[PDB]
Amino acid sequence: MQTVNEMLRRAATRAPDHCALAVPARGLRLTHAELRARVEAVAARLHADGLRPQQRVAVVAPNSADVVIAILALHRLGAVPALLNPRLKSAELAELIKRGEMTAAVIAVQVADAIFQSGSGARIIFLGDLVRDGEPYSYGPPIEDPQREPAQPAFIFYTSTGLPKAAIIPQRAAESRVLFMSTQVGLRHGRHNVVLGLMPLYHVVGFFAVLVAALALDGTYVVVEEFRPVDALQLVQQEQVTSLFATPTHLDALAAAAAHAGSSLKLDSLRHVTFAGATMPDAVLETVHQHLPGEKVNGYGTTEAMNSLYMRQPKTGTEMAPGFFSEVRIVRIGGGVDEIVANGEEGELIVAASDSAFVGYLNQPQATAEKLQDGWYRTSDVAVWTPEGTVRILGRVDDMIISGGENIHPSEIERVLGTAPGVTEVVVIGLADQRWGQSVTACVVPRLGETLSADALDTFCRSSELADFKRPKRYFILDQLPKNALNKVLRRQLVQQVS
Amino acid sequence: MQTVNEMLRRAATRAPDHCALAVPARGLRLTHAELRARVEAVAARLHADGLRPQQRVAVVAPNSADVVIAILALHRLGAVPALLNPRLKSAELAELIKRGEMTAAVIAVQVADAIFQSGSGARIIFLGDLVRDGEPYSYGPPIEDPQREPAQPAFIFYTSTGLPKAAIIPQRAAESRVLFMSTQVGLRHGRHNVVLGLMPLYHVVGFFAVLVAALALDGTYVVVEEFRPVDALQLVQQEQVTSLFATPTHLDALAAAAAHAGSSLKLDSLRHVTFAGATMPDAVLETVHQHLPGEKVNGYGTTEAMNSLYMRQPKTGTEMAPGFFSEVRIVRIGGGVDEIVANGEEGELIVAASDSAFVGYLNQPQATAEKLQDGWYRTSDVAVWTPEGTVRILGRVDDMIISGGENIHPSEIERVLGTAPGVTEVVVIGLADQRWGQSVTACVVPRLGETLSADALDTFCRSSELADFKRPKRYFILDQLPKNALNKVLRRQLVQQVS
Ligand SMILES: O=C(O)c1ccc(Cl)c(Cl)c1
Numbered sequence: 001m002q003t004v005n006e007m008l009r010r011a012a013t014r015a016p017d018h019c020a021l022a023v024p025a026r027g028l029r030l031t032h033a034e035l036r037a038r039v040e041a042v043a044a045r046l047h048a049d050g051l052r053p054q055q056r057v058a059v060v061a062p063n064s065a066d067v068v069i070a071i072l073a074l075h076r077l078g079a080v081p082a083l084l085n086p087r088l089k090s091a092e093l094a095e096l097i098k099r100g101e102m103t104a105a106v107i108a109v110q111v112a113d114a115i116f117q118s119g120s121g122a123r124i125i126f127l128g129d130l131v132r133d134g135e136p137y138s139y140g141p142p143i144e145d146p147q148r149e150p151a152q153p154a155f156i157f158y159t160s161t162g163l164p165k166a167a168i169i170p171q172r173a174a175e176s177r178v179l180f181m182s183t184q185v186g187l188r189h190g191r192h193n194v195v196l197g198l199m200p201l202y203h204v205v206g207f208f209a210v211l212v213a214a215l216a217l218d219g220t221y222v223v224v225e226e227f228r229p230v231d232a233l234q235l236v237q238q239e240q241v242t243s244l245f246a247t248p249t250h251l252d253a254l255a256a257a258a259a260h261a262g263s264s265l266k267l268d269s270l271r272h273v274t275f276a277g278a279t280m281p282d283a284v285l286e287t288v289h290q291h292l293p294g295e296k297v298n299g300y301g302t303t304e305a306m307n308s309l310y311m312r313q314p315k316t317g318t319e320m321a322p323g324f325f326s327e328v329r330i331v332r333i334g335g336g337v338d339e340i341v342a343n344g345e346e347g348e349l350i351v352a353a354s355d356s357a358f359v360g361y362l363n364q365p366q367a368t369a370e371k372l373q374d375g376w377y378r379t380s381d382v383a384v385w386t387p388e389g390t391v392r393i394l395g396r397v398d399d400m401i402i403s404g405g406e407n408i409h410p411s412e413i414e415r416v417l418g419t420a421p422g423v424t425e426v427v428v429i430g431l432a433d434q435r436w437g438q439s440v441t442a443c444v445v446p447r448l449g450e451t452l453s454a455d456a457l458d459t460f461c462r463s464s465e466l467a468d469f470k471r472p473k474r475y476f477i478l479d480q481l482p483k484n485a486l487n488k489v490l491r492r493q494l495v496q497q498v499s
Numbered sequence: 500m501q502t503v504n505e506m507l508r509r510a511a512t513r514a515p516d517h518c519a520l521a522v523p524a525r526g527l528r529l530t531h532a533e534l535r536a537r538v539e540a541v542a543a544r545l546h547a548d549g550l551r552p553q554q555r556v557a558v559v560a561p562n563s564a565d566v567v568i569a570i571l572a573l574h575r576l577g578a579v580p581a582l583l584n585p586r587l588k589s590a591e592l593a594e595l596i597k598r599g600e601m602t603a604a605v606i607a608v609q610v611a612d613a614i615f616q617s618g619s620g621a622r623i624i625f626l627g628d629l630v631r632d633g634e635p636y637s638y639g640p641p642i643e644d645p646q647r648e649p650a651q652p653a654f655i656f657y658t659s660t661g662l663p664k665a666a667i668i669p670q671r672a673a674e675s676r677v678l679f680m681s682t683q684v685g686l687r688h689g690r691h692n693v694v695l696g697l698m699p700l701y702h703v704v705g706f707f708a709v710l711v712a713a714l715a716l717d718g719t720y721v722v723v724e725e726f727r728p729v730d731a732l733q734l735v736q737q738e739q740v741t742s743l744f745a746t747p748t749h750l751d752a753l754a755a756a757a758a759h760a761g762s763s764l765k766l767d768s769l770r771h772v773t774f775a776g777a778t779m780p781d782a783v784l785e786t787v788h789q790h791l792p793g794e795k796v797n798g799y800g801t802t803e804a805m806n807s808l809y810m811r812q813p814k815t816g817t818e819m820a821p822g823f824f825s826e827v828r829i830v831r832i833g834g835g836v837d838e839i840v841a842n843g844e845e846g847e848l849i850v851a852a853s854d855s856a857f858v859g860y861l862n863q864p865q866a867t868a869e870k871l872q873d874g875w876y877r878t879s880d881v882a883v884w885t886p887e888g889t890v891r892i893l894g895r896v897d898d899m900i901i902s903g904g905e906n907i908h909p910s911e912i913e914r915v916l917g918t919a920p921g922v923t924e925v926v927v928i929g930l931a932d933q934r935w936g937q938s939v940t941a942c943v944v945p946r947l948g949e950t951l952s953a954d955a956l957d958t959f960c961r962s963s964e965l966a967d968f969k970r971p972k973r974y975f976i977l978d979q980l981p982k983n984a985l986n987k988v989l990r991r992q993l994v995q996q997v998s
């Protein structure tokens with residue numbers, strides 16, 4: 001094995017005086033040497049306050065040099081961090097820590113009350129009581145490196161039917177979760193590496209593939225506390241960013257800035273632009289190609305298994321192929337891992353549960369047994385093999401629509417309607433109905449000020465590429481879609497509100 | 500873990516119909532699918548002939564598609580191949596198999612008698628009785644994949660005082676022995692990969708970093724049964740070679756051909772030229788830069804621990820720095836791993852005994868305990884830290900010369916004398932003597948036809964860069980140097996022949 005801790009420590013010894021963390025806004029830099037000292041010291045101080053290996057500690061913070069120190073220090077201690085989205089509802093967070101049977105929670109958010117008053121046995125730690133603006137608050141004797149087993153829990157990330165599940169990431173999962181950035185994305189070891197921390201740390205990509213990779217390759221992690229497209233493009237040039245991994249939205253922002261930015265603005269050093277673009281619309285992709293530099297690679301992955309597919313220089317966003325570490329198959333929906341589909345027939349994408357795999361969801365054994373089957377991980381996504389020997393992601397099995405014996409993916413239809421003039425957003429659901437089973441229904445929201453009509457949206461679709469049966473049978477023009485705390489559509493529920 | 504077998508199998512499933520092996524001379528190609536079938540079938544047939552996991556089998560063959568199949572098939576079975584240099588003396592090979600307590604030996608060499616008559620309990624298998632020109636001889640039912648433990652032995656390579664020691668390479672060592680080609684050398688996963696098999700398979704680089712890497716990255720291994728510089732340069736262009744790892748001699752041959760080859764001869768696709776160039780003279784290096792394309796990377800490594808240092812685009816051959824997976828130190832010669840030297844003081848290079856490390860020499864526990872110390876591997880090489888924070892390899896501790904309290908590395912002096920006009924080869928030894936301890940002595944061999952004199956070689960050195968004390972105190976002009984079966988100088992013994 002090489003654990004996270006080990007990866008980062010060996011790095012320290014290879015490049016003590018090279019820059020590890022940079023918060024350019026706060027005019028802060030730490031070398032690898034300096035960043036080890038602060039992990040060490042915080043680690044000791046949390047241990048001095050009585051808090052042992054294998055104990056789960058929650059982390060609720062937005063991206064900052066301070067939380068990076070906090071998380072590493074916990075792992076260095078031996079505590080198993082459970083990283084949580086700070087945009088979750090107070091209620092929700094308080095719940096997951098209660099369920100999580102967690103010894104403490106480091107927070108930088110208040111929402112503190114929602115916890116202190118959750119009835120949870122969870123010692124509430126203010127983040128700024130540990131470290132703040134780099135140098136931390138230290139006492140206790142330098143503690144020892146605890147033994148770590150390959151399958152022992154190491155970190156806990158959250159996914160999402162009901163409340164988000166808690167995926168346990170074993171110690172042995174770190175390496176391939178990092179190195180796929182190198183085998184797939186083309187990063188190599190070296191002090192030239194300057195990685196821009198745009199992806200949140202509470203996400204496996206933001207943590208393993210961005211933070212950890214950047215450090216473990218003896219490079220520099222550039223901290224970003226708040227995303228602004230121009231400021232970011234400025235960081236690239238100013239910081240010598242060599243690679244960045246960004247969400248489809250981030251990219252759209254960046255590509256348009258770069259376009260309305262002539263070359264002002266030398267993005268020369270940017271060599272890799274990486275993204276999980278299964279859901280990236282065709283339009284955005286190509287503004288990314290036209291307007292941003294460096295090699296673009298498209299990746300598909302999951303919290304459970306990390307990276308499963310990719311495309312260098314992608315033409316579309318849906319169509320990818322497995323790289324190093326991965327093994328994949330497409331099996332009949334609801335059926336044995338061994339039931340590979342014909343070719344051209346759609347099915348569930350499933351991927352080998354090797355070393356990068358999680359070990360189960362904390363305290364959800366049915367959930368786990370729904371997902372880890374005979375040493376395979378079940379994506380719950382629907383794919384098909386292209387005659388070109390690649391995998392086309394069609395959409396989530398859960399969102400699939402079954403309309404008189406036929407397979408309809410709301411996402412396809414959402415991508416066409418999304419371009420109809422006048423449409424600010426759309427979700428396509430299957431109304432519990434007839435023709436039969438389910439009738440394809442479009443819920444669309446107009447651009448500020450503007451009118452839509454079902455007639456006009458139908459003619460638009462009629463003029464479009466969609467096969468007969470895919471066309472919506474019905475439209476509801478709404479002035480907003482109900483979403484959860486995480487800007488994401490309450491599908492099951494929208495249905496109640498329209499049927 | 501990811502074992503060799505697993506790496507190659509997962510590849511098979513990602514790229515069944517892509518080309519794995521190519522013997523262009525014999526006009527032979529196999530896809531990954533085809534290459535699995537033949538590993539499977541041979542594996543079964545050796546198992547059918549009664550031969551179980553963990554049993555050591557010797558392999559004595561020059562590079563060929565057939566031996567690649569043989570070796571993989573043994574590992575797939577579960578047998579632990581011990582790969583041996585075919586240029587070893589009949590006597591010598593017969594010995595190492597006796598010592599090795601080996602159940603069988605696959606040979607393609609005769610020298611067969613030297614074994615059949617060695618008194619060894621070693622079933623002699625002709626290679627051509629198993630597989631020949633691709634398709635093999637098959638019987639038995641398809642056997643099962645045996646369980647493999649991370650520290651379980653997996654392969655056995657040979658190094659070299661007396662007879663070469665047998666380094667056991669555990670199952671868990673495969674991955675980083677492959678992936679350092681990607682973190683250091685910059686190879687990424689992909690069917691574009693075309694790797695030229697110039698390095699022999701009985702060498703860890705030839706096996707892990709060349710064969711296995713090429714396959715495991717879903718690429719193509721180009722078989723080379725015999726090295727000819729022009730033929731090779733032709734293979735590059737013709738084969739679309741993307742990378743090659745070659746010995747300092749191979750390179751010299753290739754660089755001179757490319758130079759006396761205009762561009763005839765488009766070496767466009769060659770992107771990585773890699774070598775262990777610690778001993779590469781300054782002249783050759785730079786003909787490699789002037790005359791060969793693609794990125795040049797210099798590596799230092801050992802059988803015991805694989806890759807420990809490297810330089811992208813190297814200026815000299817002696818000066819390198821640790822990459823991903825490695826941890827290194829320079830400690831006082833003969834002393835505790837914890838005795839780091841001052842800075843600028845010379846010492847023994849030692850490297851962390853992590854996952855890529857061997858587990859010991861087969862049946863040499865003192866030897867092992869001389870080499871694996873408190874979880875470090877001891878290179879027995881002498882290095883120094885440059886003020887530039889890099890490691891300079893000076894030479895082997897064993898060849899070091901101690902001349903009145905001073906450290907002299909024969910290799911430095913050998914590099915200067917090697918350019919003196921009229922010198923075809925030179926070795927510098929320390930005569931057991933005075934001034935004291937040891938007197939620096941040069942043994943040189945003239946160019947065909949030519950004369951040398953000590954006077955003239957002294958004036959040459961006098962005109963050269965060497966510091967006072969390094970100059971040879973004595974010359975012996977010899978018309979050959981005694982070498983072992985492996986074209987390498989019998990240092991200890993030359994001394995007898997001159998003193
Ligand atoms: O959540 C995802 O989309 C995701 C998660 C992990 C990885 Cl590696 C990738 Cl490429 C994507």
Ligand SMILES: O=C(O)c1ccc(Cl)c(Cl)c1
Pocket residue numbers: 703704708774775798799800801802805806807
């Ligand atoms: O034997 C060597 O020189 C050697 C052995 C292994 C490696 Cl990886 C390298 Cl870079 C060199």
